[model samples]
Target: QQCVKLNDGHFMPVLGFGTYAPPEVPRSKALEVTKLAIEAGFRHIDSAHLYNNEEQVGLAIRSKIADGSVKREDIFYTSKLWSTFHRPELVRPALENSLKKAQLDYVDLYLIHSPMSLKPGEELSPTDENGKVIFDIVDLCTTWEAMEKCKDAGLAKSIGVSNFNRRQLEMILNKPGLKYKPVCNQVECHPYFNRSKLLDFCKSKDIVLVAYSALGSQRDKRWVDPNSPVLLEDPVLCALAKKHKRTPALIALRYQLQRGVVVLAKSYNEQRIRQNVQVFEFQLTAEDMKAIDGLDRNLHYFNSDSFASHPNYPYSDEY
Candidate 1:
């Protein structure tokens, strides 16, 4: 597998297995699928606190290690700090909670899920009870500072943000007494929504860009619209895939890896999991990269536009 070195001097695999399942997928199934992913040569597993499968995912990791398939240090596991945990004091405890759930002593990378928050356990709705906006950005900064404390305390090897736009990232960069610079930014990136400008900004800042929904996220009902454009069926990707004797999905993944982005491809299908890891074994030509780049439409599947309606929305300026 190819690796990208973070600002903190740690290397993260360029490709990882994402584990964000729908509510209906049983924990046992999630565990079984995760075990298959590990056996298929996936060393990086991306998860989040809200995904609700850490216990099962952890079990798969431990099971693989026990069977001598991988060592604890060989795997790179990532979990996020949910919005509800976006308070200065709640950060460490939140991470500790994730560790408890994952049954791991520490996570390789920890991320702030988003730049929006409500009180812990607060329900997310289209609007507040009083028809007022609810998300808070100041709370995010407070939580980020606390995340820095985690890094200092060695609870997490690195700290970063997810779903943050360029302007939101600027806020953190400009914040005073910021103990740690975010090492990476994870976001929904696929051929449909390539996010070139935001990625350029991240590159200039030395922040690694980690992409989710690399396969177009067909399984995410909330984001998958029947009428929406299909990235895998794109003529450009299809032609390139045929040229390389691979599937469009592999071509899509290779595009990101060649562009210097870390990609998280999700799949419970055992064969697909094995195929996804082989992305690093081949190289896309410069022309292939350009053709893929030309397919960018800036159409995001996971639109947090509703986030702009929040009272303390950090990205109101951009959204």
Candidate 2:
């Protein structure tokens, strides 16, 4: 299996199994799909505390270990620090909560779920009494310092950030007395919004660019626009898939792999979970890759300003 080396000296599997499902989907689905994912040869499992399914996913890993199907050290488990826990003092307790829920001693990789922070609380996305979302004004540098401590304390092997824009990333990259730079940056990236510029910057800095929503939205109508352009339904992707004799989803997955970006394939279905991992079998031609590049539209599912107005709102960097 191909692995990407991080600045922290840990190697991560190039492909990861994402376990983010819509709220309507049962939390138990995380366990079912995670078990199927590990069985299907996925060593990296990407999950977050906001998903409300860490315990179940943890249980699945425990079951797999008990059966001797995989060893605890073999599985690369990832969990995130949500905005609510972005406070410097709250970082450890928040990670401890996830560790306890996961029943694991430590997470291989722990990330700040987003660039923004929230009032220290139980809710992942905190809101004011009037119901407007309250964005915390915590210093990310302090939070990062705490994350460094988490790494030093042997709770997380590595630490990173997610949903950050170019400026947000530079905030940590240029921090004074920086102990460890972010080994990776996880963001919403696909052919529609290829994030080529940010990917280039991360590559220049030796920070692995991790992609989510690779095959597009999970069709969750609430957070997802009802009339958004469906990536899997793109005619260009369809044609490329036919030419490659693979599924459109596989084409999308392979596209990121060739770009030196780590991709997360989120699926709850058994058959598709098996199929998504088949991206390693073939490579997209340079012409095919260039043609896919022409389809960029800068479309995004998150970073919407219609319902949010944080001072540090991302997505303004145009990457």
Candidate 3:
């Protein structure tokens, strides 16, 4: 597997298997698909506490280990601290909770799920009686300090953040006594929303840009707008796919790799999971890469409408 060195001196596989499934999908599916992913040659696994399937994902990894297919050291796993647990006091407990569920001694990476904070409690999306999301204001740098402690204690090998914009990233990078800079900023990046400026900014700071929704998205009604066109159906991507005799999904994935961005591909089907690995086998010409680069539409599949009014909301920034 190809890997990128983080600023914290850790190596992360370039292509990660995203373990997020919509709430409608049975949790057991995570266990089965994760096992299939591992068998299909994926060493990097991306999961989150919010996904509510870490226990199943853990079982899959354990099953693979028991079968002598791979060892714990052979895999790199990532988990995230959810919005409800952003408080400095709650940070370690949240990570410990994930470790407990996943039954792992330590995760390869841990990330702050989002810059926005929610009411601290058992509710994942703490909401008011009116169905409005309960948002809270917490000093992100303070929350970041707790993240640093997690790294110090070896609960997580490396700590970073997700869904943060350039300004939020700078806030931590320029912190007065910053102990460790973020290794990556996991955000929604694909051809449509290429994130060229943010990618450059991250590169200048030595932070790897980790991309989610790299195949656009699953078009889940709750998170995605119903009318958003399918990304894989774009004319340019489809044409390139035909020219290369590959799927549009592969062209999308390859574009990110050539640009040095770590991309996560989420699929529940066994055949699609197996086919995704072929991304590394094929090469995209410089011209093909340039054509893909021109497809940026500044379109965001995930607008984060729920947290639009939050003070720490990130997407509003130009980057």
Candidate 4:
């Protein structure tokens, strides 16, 4: 696996497995899939408290380590602090919940789930049937301060944010007592929504970019518009795949890694999970990179507009 060194001197794998399915997925199934991913050569696993599957992910990790398939330090585990935990006092407790659920003393990386903050136990749903979230900007800063504390206390080796834009990042960077800057920003990035400007800003600040939905997130029907074009089937990616004798999915992933972005491939399928890691074995040329770059349409599959309706919604303007 390729590695990206964080500002704090720790390294993270450029490719990881993402477990972001809804809470409905059975715990047993999640564990089974995680174990299969490990056996398929995925050393990095990404989970979040919002996903509510940390216990299942933990079981899979421990099982692999116990069976001598992988070591604790060899695996890179990531979890995010939910928006409901945005209060300063709740930050550490939120992380503790993740650690307790995952059965691990510490996580390799911890991320603030979103730029928007919701009231404690507000219950933000994946759909609009639930009540909308109320945003609180001051509380988000307070919670971020607490995340920095997690880094200092060694609960998380590195700290970062997910779904934050340039302006939101600047707000945190300019805050008082900001001893640690976010080392990365995890967001919905792929061939369709390339996020060139945001990626460049993060790069300039030495913050690594972690991309989710790198394969166009086919499973997320709510976000995947039937009328929208399939990124993996794009003519450019298909031609490149044919030239390199690789799958279009791998080509899509390689495009991001070659640009210095960490990509999370979410899949429980045994063969696809293994194929996802093969991206490291090959390289994309400068010309190939340019071709992929031209495929950007500024399209985003996970548009959190309901969250955006919050008073302090971060993406209300640009999105």
RMSD of each: 2.2, 1.1, 0.9, 2.2
Residues 1-319, model 1: lDDT tens digits: 6789998899998889999888887779889999999888888999988898988999999999999999999999999988877878778998998899889998999999877776565343334678764554455667788989998888899899998888888888888887788999998888887878888999998999999988887545575556778778889889988889999999999899888899999988888888888887788999888888888776766555656666555444443
List the lowest-lDDT window of 10 residues for candidate 4. Answer: 124-133
Would you give me the overall lDDT of model 3? 0.94
Q: For model 2, how does the per-residue alpha-carbon lDDT over 126-172 read when each residue is reduced to its tens digit?
A: 67799878877899999999999999999999898898888898999
lDDT value for model 1: 0.84
Where's the lowest-lDDT run of ten residues in candidate 1? Answer: 118-127
Descending-lDDT candidate ranking: 3, 2, 4, 1
- lDDT of model 2, residue 201: 93
Q: Write the per-residue lDDT of candidate 3 for residues 114-160, one digit (tens) a residue.
A: 99999999889888999999998899999999999999999999999
Per-model TM-score on C-alpha atoms: 0.93, 0.97, 0.98, 0.93
lDDT value, candidate 4, whole model: 0.85
Return the top candidate by lDDT. 3
lDDT of 4 at 173: 81
Q: Residue 79 CA error for candidate 3 (Å)? A: 0.3
Worst window of 10 by summed lDDT in candidate 2: 302-311
Shift in Å, residue 115, candidate 1: 0.5
Which pairs clash in model 4? Answer: none
The candidate with the higher TM-score, 2 or 3, is 3
Misplaced by over 4 Å in model 1 are 122-133, 303-305, 311-319
Off by over 4 Å in 4: 122-130, 317-319
